[PDB]
Design a protein around this ligand. Structure first.
Ligand SMILES: *C(=O)CCCCCCCCC
Length: 13
């Protein structure tokens, strides 16, 4: 889960 980002609005999740 969340290979992008790991944040609701940060690094396109
Ligand atoms: C997020 O949806 C998945 C995070 C876990 C990925 C594990 C990959 C390796 C399995 C052997």
């Amino acid at each position: 889960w969340x290979d992008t980002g790991a944040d609701x609005d940060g690094x396109e999740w």
